[PDB]
Amino acid sequence: AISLIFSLKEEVGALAKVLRLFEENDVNLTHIESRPSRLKKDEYEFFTHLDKRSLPALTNIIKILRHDIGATVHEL
Amino acid sequence: AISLIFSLKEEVGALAKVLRLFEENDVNLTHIESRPSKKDEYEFFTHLDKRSLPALTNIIKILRHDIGATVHELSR
Ligand SMILES: N[C@@H](Cc1ccccc1)C(=O)O
Ligand SMILES: N[C@@H](Cc1ccccc1)C(=O)O
């Protein structure tokens, strides 16, 4: 499984923006879970699985999340 | 915190559409977790902050009758 972790600044629609970006890149989730960040009081972390057909978008959505959104992101 | 548990039909952008509804109603999540369900669906466990309460009747309307999700639980 493709595993991706990212951290977002807390606000309404924070996750929705990420998922819109995923959808627009034909990325499809098989798992999501959140937890409050232990590092920053104003951040939430998200652990996701993506299906294998999402692989061609993977390098690129990582860069977009970091660049367009300012998320901290890591492929696991 | 408001507990809301619902299923969606599996498709690219399934969750994005729901989170757009939430966002447009000023609903803020504090937790999300998915699980595969019904073979072609996913179940979502969410918590909404108390400030989301004025939105509940509208998001339930749209979730049930527009998006066509099944709501398994709503509790506060
Ligand atoms: N595969 C769907 C539903 C889904 C979302 C998140 C986790 C698991 C399933 C999507 O990407 O929107
Ligand atoms: N509160 C933010 C981030 C978040 C999403 C989902 C779960 C937890 C936190 C939002 O509603 O988008």
Author numbering:
A (entry chain A): 34 to 109
B (entry chain C): 34 to 70, 73 to 111
From the primary publication:
Phenylalanine hydroxylase (PAH; EC 1.14.16.1) catalyzes the first step of l-phenylalanine (Phe) degradation via its hydroxylation to l-tyrosine, and serves to metabolize excess Phe in the diet. PAH-RD contains an ACT (Aspartate kinase, Chorismate mutase and TyrA) fold commonly found in enzymes for binding small molecule ligands. Some, if not all, of these regulatory properties are likely mediated by the N-terminal RD, as deletion of the domain liberates the enzyme from activation and renders it constitutively active.
In this study, we have determined the high resolution crystal structure of human PAH-RD bound with Phe. In the final model, the peptide regions Gly19-Gly33 and Asp112-Val118 are not present, which can be due to intrinsic disorder, or possible trypsinization, of the two regions. The dimer interface is largely polar in nature, comprising main-chain/side-chain hydrogen bonds contributed from two amino acid regions Glu43-Leu48 and Asn61-Ser67, as well as from a bound Phe ligand. Omit Fo-Fc electron density map revealed two Phe molecules bound to the hPAH-RD homodimer, at the interface of the two βαββαβ folds along the plane of the 2-fold axis (inset). Each Phe binding site comprises residues from both protomers, including the ‘ExVxAL’ (aa 43–48) and ‘YxF’ (aa 77–79) sequence regions of one protomer, and the ‘NLTIxS’ (aa 61–67) region of the other. Significant Cα differences (RMSD >2 Å) between the two structures are found, and regions that undergo most conformational changes in the presence of Phe include: (i) loop L1 and the first turn of helix α1 (aa 42–49), which brings in residues of the ‘ExVxAL’ motif for Phe binding, and (ii) the segment (aa 59–75) containing loop L2, strand β2 and loop L3, which is displaced outwards to ‘open up’ the Phe-binding site. The key finding of our study is that the binding of Phe to PAH-RD restructures the ACT fold, forming the necessary inter-subunit dimer interface and the resultant Phe allosteric site. To reconcile the difference with the recently reported rat PAH full-length structure, which did not reveal ACT:ACT interactions in the unliganded form12, we propose that the rat full-length PAH structure in the absence of Phe and our human PAH-RD structure in the presence of Phe could represent the unliganded ‘active-site blocking mode’ and the Phe-bound ‘multimerization mode’ of the domain, respectively.
